Structure formats: structure tokens, C-alpha cells
Ligand binder design. Structure first.
Ligand SMILES: Cc1cc2nc3c(=O)[nH]c(=O)nc-3n(C[C@H](O)[C@H](O)[C@H](O)COP(=O)(O)OP(=O)(O)OC[C@H]3O[C@@H](n4cnc5c(N)ncnc54)[C@H](O)[C@@H]3O)c2cc1C
Ligand SMILES: Cc1cc2nc3c(=O)[nH]c(=O)nc-3n(C[C@H](O)[C@H](O)[C@H](O)COP(=O)(O)OP(=O)(O)OC[C@H]3O[C@@H](n4cnc5c(N)ncnc54)[C@H](O)[C@@H]3O)c2cc1C
Ligand SMILES: O=c1cc(CCc2ccccc2)[nH]nc1O
Ligand SMILES: O=c1cc(CCc2ccccc2)[nH]nc1O
Lengths: 340, 340
């Protein structure tokens, strides 16, 4: 039973591990391999702040609600031990800024201490008329990626730097199953005009004094496009830039400028931070995550493909859910192959 | 009108300044001079984390209450100028924890958004069964100290490094009001037996992931005498050591071990912290603070003396209200002296 997982990103690695942890007992020669064009120092996943927080109303696909949920419980049930900071996982409270009023978020009750910004609080914010306050999780992109990797590697799972041209180049080369974890780049193996990139740019700056994330919103510019401050482990991230169809993986002046103005306006102590650096990446956007099976009809018999992409700008808030899902689906492939 | 401030910790410096800003437009020769034996790194002030938060229950003297409020009110009022970082003044949220339930603290309304621990929050704490959570401020002693200094100096209050032997050395050598800010050490210049060492000791450590203070409380072991963990700007303050009468300004191997255990039991991820260093100081303990006048019946006239010391484990928490009050006394002098 040989398995190729494409994408060394959060999804790929989470689903890799999640399938392996689940099925090495109940399956003789489980071979797993990740094939990836870009590896952990250089993926989109590597760019995310890594705070957990689903959009503010509820999904096209009300199950995501459940996937985010459990991502949450899982991380939190791991929040004290020697592992936590390896992983780069730790707890963090902070703010949600809105002009007008707005209904509670579905999720309200997964997080701890969710509540509404009382008025002493909102004075602090002259540009804003309302918010929430709550304690959430960061799972920092880089670390999660580096640990997952050392767990996969202790599990005998084998990495390979490549471009996969198409499912069948890989069926062809030998594989009962293809877990498709390929992100914004999904479409280039099997067209899907539903997927598009949410371009983003953030600044990592020096501000250790920052102890709260602060998230503004402004539907006049939409989601993921109003300035945010996510204190990280080592450094604080500064963004607010979302833009459909932008395929420029390259830092932009105008964006910088927008990031830094809004962020300084939001918290002026930042005017003294030292910029460490800056980065772009591509949210894989889509009305809903794609995660289903597809028997790829292909020579003497059909290979099996699990699709697990389109997580957009909430990839880490969810990944674990997803991964436990593509694992279930995976099991099924098994019972059918009369192997379960 | 020449004025001597003894002591250069937080009490002195704030009182010095507060007095300068209040009264230098209304005294022509108003000469200010600060006398002190230990200065800016070498004082009890430097050793405090700088967390704002008054004892659980309400004070032997219920103005101390207002002077926390005031102090707090103000600092918070400056939260966000583009100094606060210089100040080392910044917001922090965090946990209070207790084995039993407890009446709300008196100040709950001063702190940002205080609220009791929920069951979920709670489970990160086997060994504690009840508690609070609220957002507050830290005023990091080392910085606030450096700051008041650079303020004081432009204002050209002058500083000399020197152990004063008695009030009258100073009155003698020509001064007019004397403001006594001398900390735990007030005894060497006027017997006062209500005042004694809260010798505390702390560890400063590299845990850049912690974004919350956590304070462990217990009647059994008594105030500041339990595990607490306070994110500072560069570093994390690690302590829960209080001991009456101990006069040893030297770091203690048991205490060393006591801090590290209490903190690790509480936040096992702290196993990775790098110890960076460690330190001891003397809480100026006393039933109530001495902020009052006295006419020292020196030589020909009297010289007046403001007493401002014995502030406990909570100087930073209160120092401002104290300084105002201390200047309101200063100003009560001038009129009865007919210089207003
Ligand atoms: C600025 C910004 C901030 C964000 N902040 C957050 C946040 O706080 N929280 C949160 O939950 N999410 C956040 N996100 C969202 C999150 O980053 C994405 O959901 C997530 O990282 C995507 O996971 P992935 O594995 O799907 O994609 P990626 O991380 O890009 O995985 C893609 C992999 O696909 C490989 N690949 C593609 N095609 C092929 C091929 N044919 N052959 C081989 N390899 C291939 C690439 O080389 C790479 O290995 C943010 C996104 C951005 C842009
Ligand atoms: C471990 C620890 C943690 C703490 N954490 C906090 C906290 O989180 N928050 C909070 O609000 N408080 C905290 N405190 C309380 C705070 O530390 C003190 O109350 C404060 O430093 C006392 O003010 P002070 O200037 O009187 O003391 P000091 O700063 O020691 O004032 C003493 C000054 O007077 C001088 N002096 C004394 N006698 C003479 C003399 N004859 N001649 C010349 N100079 C003299 C010394 O050189 C020094 O300048 C903490 C204390 C400790 C020990
Ligand atoms: O830029 C991003 C920032 C984040 C986390 C913070 C956030 C969460 C909800 C709404 C707005 C911002 N997630 N995904 C992204 O793309
Ligand atoms: O050691 C100390 C620590 C602090 C601040 C944090 C704190 C506040 C309330 C209860 C326990 C700790 N203040 N004063 C001290 O002496």
C-alpha cells in the first residue's frame, strides 16, 4: 500500500501524519512519501501569523465549523508540556475592532473568555466604535511545519523535492493513493476556476512589548484587509492586505506602506519597532474547502485521490479537523479495498 | 527655597517630579536636589516586575485605595503616547488563581475587563481550583526609572550619590523641606518599628512565548509568597518569595529552587527558559504607608519633612497617587510659610 502526499505545507503535513498515526498498525507495507515543489522554509504556510480565528459568520459548508473546533481543542489540550513551544504553540488574548455593531461569531464558545469590549476599552480605540475581547491560540507557521516534519521523519515517511505534473505521472509511477495537498496551486493538476489566490503581505517587526493581538475589521475593504497585529513568539507580525487574483509573490511598496500606516495608526508605539523583514504569500481561496475523494480513471486500474485544499486564510485554524477528515475518507478507501 | 529628596527609587523620583511640575511656576528660587546611596540599577524598584495590582482585600487606610486608582488611571491615560515603550509601560492580561472562591477584588473596576475564570480556562490549572482574569498594566521599574531620570534632569533637579546620616546633616547643610523616600531603610534616619523587610527574590528568564501574567495565591504560604510569572518587555519575571525580617540582599540557592519549581509546576513549558539572571530586594513592609508631615525641630527654625515610604509590595502600583498627595502637602507648606 504505497501513498504519495503532494505538498509539504500545513495541510500536506498534517494529513500525512494524521493518516500515518492512524493506520500503521492496521496495514502492512504503508509507504508514505511527500512530494513537494516547496518545502518548509518557503511555503505560504511559513508566512502566516498562525492565530486561530475562523471568519465571523458561519461557513458555506457548516462542517468546517466542526473542523475548526477540533483543531482548537486539540491544540489546547497540548498547551502545557515540553512539546508546546517546539511546535510554537502558546496562548494569546487580544482585540477585535469594528466600527459598527455586529452579531457574535458562531465560534464564540470554543475560545476562552469571549466578551465584548467594554467602554473604558474602546476609548483606547478612537478609530473604532466596538469590538470583542477573548483569549485564543497561536500555532506559528514555521515551527509547526518544522516539528510535523521531524515527527513524519521519525515515522519513516520520506520527503522528495519535486514538481508533480499530474496525478497520472504519479499513479503511473506506482501509487495506490494520492492525497492532494497542493494549495493555491491546486488548479495546475486539475483545473478549478473556484480556486483563487488571496494575495497577502505582512511585516515581521520588533515589539516585544506587544502582549495582545489586535484585529480591526472594515467590510468596506472586507476580511483579511484591515490592519492586524499578531504578536508572534520572537517577533510581531503586521498585516492587513488581501487581494483576489494577485499572482505576484513579491513584496510591494504600496502594501508595506498601507500595512505600516494602518498599524502605526492602530498602535503608535509601533512607530519604534525595527522591521525584521517582510513576506508575501497566497491564501488559497474558494467558496469551501475542497475535501472529497476521486477515483482517477487511469490505465489498468484506478488510483485513489483525496483532495485536501482550498483552506484560504484559515488553513491553520482548521488543518487538524481536515486532516482527521481526509484520514476518515482514507480509512474508507481501505474498507472498500477490503483491507479495513 | 532649596529642596532635598532622599532616595532615588520610584518613590523619590516620582515625588521629586510631581513636586517640580506642580510648583516650579510658583516659587522663584525652587532648587531641587536628590540625594541617594543606591541609584537606578541598584535599587528595590529595579527588582519589581512592575505589575499593577493592590493586595486582595482593602487597606488598613482607605486612601491607599484611591492612590492605586489614580496611579492606574494615569498610567493608563498615557498607555499609547509614543513613549510608553521608553516608559516600559504596556498593557497585559493574565490570571489570578486560588484554591477556594474569594470575593471580588476591590479594584476590579479599575482594571480592564476583569471577569472570573471559566471551567475551560481552569483546566490548565490542575493544582488550582478557582480564580480571576482581567487585563491590567506593567510599568517596568528599570525603564520607568531611567525615564523619570531623563525628565528630572532637563528640569535640572540635581542628583548626588551619597549616604545621608540624618535629617539634620541635610537641614544643617541648608535645606528647607525634606522629602523622605528612603524605602525599607527609613529606620536608619528615624527609628520606625512598624516598618520591615519583605525580602523578595526573583528570576528573569527567556520565555518569549508568554503573553499573560499568572499569579498563584495561597493563605497557607501567604502574599507574594506563592509562584508568579510575569511577562516583562525583554524577559520574564519569575518569583513568589516573601520573608519578614530577612535582611540578606543575596540570592539564595533554596529560593532559587523554590521559584523555579513553583513556576515550572505552573507552566511546564518554562522548562526551556534560559535563566538570564536573578535578584533580591526588600519590600518596604508596614501596616500603612507613611505619607505625612513632620516639623523636625532642628537648630534655629524648623525644617519641614515629608514622609513618603513604606509602600510594601506595591509601590509601582501606587506611586503616583502618593506623589500627588506628597505634593499637596508640599504645597500646604508654602502657604502657611507665605510663599503663594
Ligand atoms: C498573510 C497571511 C496570513 C495568514 N494568517 C493566518 C492565520 O493567522 N491563521 C490561519 O489559520 N491561517 C492564516 N493564513 C492562511 C494559511 O496560511 C493557509 O490556509 C495555509 O497556510 C495553506 O495551507 P496549504 O498546505 O494548503 O498551502 P501551502 O502552505 O502553500 O502548501 C503548499 C505546498 O504545495 C506544494 N505544491 C503545489 N503544487 C505542487 C506540485 N504540483 N508538485 C509539488 N508540490 C506542489 C508547494 O511546493 C508547497 O509545498 C494566512 C495566510 C496569509 C497569506
Ligand atoms: C521581588 C519584588 C517584586 C515586586 N513586584 C512589584 C510589582 O510587580 N508591582 C508593584 O507595584 N510593586 C512591586 N514590588 C514593590 C516595589 O518593589 C517597591 O515598593 C518599591 O521599589 C519601593 O519604593 P522605594 O523607592 O521606597 O524603594 P527603593 O527603590 O529601594 O527606594 C530606596 C531609595 O532610597 C535610597 N536610600 C535609603 N536610605 C538612604 C540614605 N540614608 N541615604 C541615601 N539613600 C538612601 C536607596 O539608595 C534608594 O535610592 C516588588 C517588590 C519586590 C521585592
Ligand atoms: O492575514 C491573515 C490573518 C489571519 C489571522 C488574523 C485574522 C483572523 C480573522 C480575521 C482577520 C484576521 N488569518 N489569515 C490571514 O490570511
Ligand atoms: O513579589 C511581588 C510581585 C508583585 C507583583 C505581582 C503580584 C501581585 C499580587 C500578588 C502576587 C504577585 N508585587 N509585589 C511583590 O513583592
Amino acid at each position: 500500500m504505497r501513498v504519495v502526499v503532494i505538498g509539504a505545507g500545513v495541510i500536506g503535513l498534517s494529513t500525512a501524519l494524521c493518516i500515518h498515526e492512524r493506520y500503521h498498525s492496521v496495514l502492512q507495507p504503508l509507504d508514505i512519501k511527500v512530494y513537494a515543489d516547496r518545502f518548509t522554509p518557503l511555503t505560504t504556510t511559513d508566512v502566516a501569523a498562525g492565530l486561530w480565528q475562523p471568519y465571523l459568520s458561519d461557513p458555506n459548508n457548516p462542517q468546517e465549523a466542526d473542523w475548526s473546533q477540533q483543531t482548537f481543542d486539540y491544540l489546547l489540550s497540548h498547551v502545557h508540556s515540553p512539546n508546546a513551544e517546539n511546535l510554537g504553540l502558546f496562548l494569546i488574548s487580544g482585540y477585535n475592532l469594528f466600527h459598527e455593531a455586529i452579531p457574535d461569531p458562531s465560534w464564540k464558545d470554543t475560545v476562552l473568555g469571549f466578551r465584548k469590549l467594554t467602554p473604558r476599552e474602546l476609548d483606547m480605540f478612537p478609530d473604532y466604535g466596538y469590538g470583542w475581547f477573548h483569549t485564543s491560540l497561536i500555532l506559528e507557521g514555521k515551527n509547526y511545519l518544522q516539528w510535523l516534519t521531524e515527527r513524519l521523519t521519525e515515522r519513516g515517511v520520506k520527503f522528495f523535492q519535486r514538481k508533480v505534473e499530474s496525478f497520472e505521472e504519479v499513479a503511473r509511477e506506482g501509487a495506490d493513493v494520492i492525497v492532494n495537498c497542493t494549495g493555491v496551486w491546486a488548479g495546475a493538476l486539475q483545473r478549478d476556476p473556484l480556486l483563487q489566490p488571496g494575495r497577502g503581505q505582512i511585516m515581521k517587526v520588533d515589539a516585544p512589548w506587544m502582549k495582545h493581538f489586535i484585529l480591526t475589521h472594515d467590510p468596506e475593504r472586507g476580511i483579511y484587509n484591515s490592519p492586524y497585529i499578531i504578536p508572534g513568539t520572537q517577533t510581531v507580525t503586521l498585516g492587513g492586505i488581501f487581494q483576489l487574483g494577485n499572482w505576484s509573490e513579491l513584496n510591494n511598496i504600496q502594501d508595506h506602506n498601507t500595512i505600516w500606516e494602518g498599524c502605526c495608526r492602530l498602535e503608535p508605539t509601533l512607530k519604534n519597532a525595527r522591521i525584521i523583514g517582510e513576506r508575501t504569500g497566497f491564501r488559497p481561496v474558494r467558496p469551501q474547502i475542497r475535501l472529497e475523494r476521486e477515483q482517477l480513471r487511469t490505465g489498468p486500474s484506478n488510483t485513489e485521490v483525496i483532495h485536501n485544499y482550498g483552506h484560504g486564510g484559515y488553513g491553520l485554524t482548521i488543518h487538524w479537523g481536515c486532516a482527521l477528515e481526509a484520514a476518515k475518507l482514507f480509512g474508507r478507501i481501505l474498507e472498500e479495498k477490503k483491507l479495513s
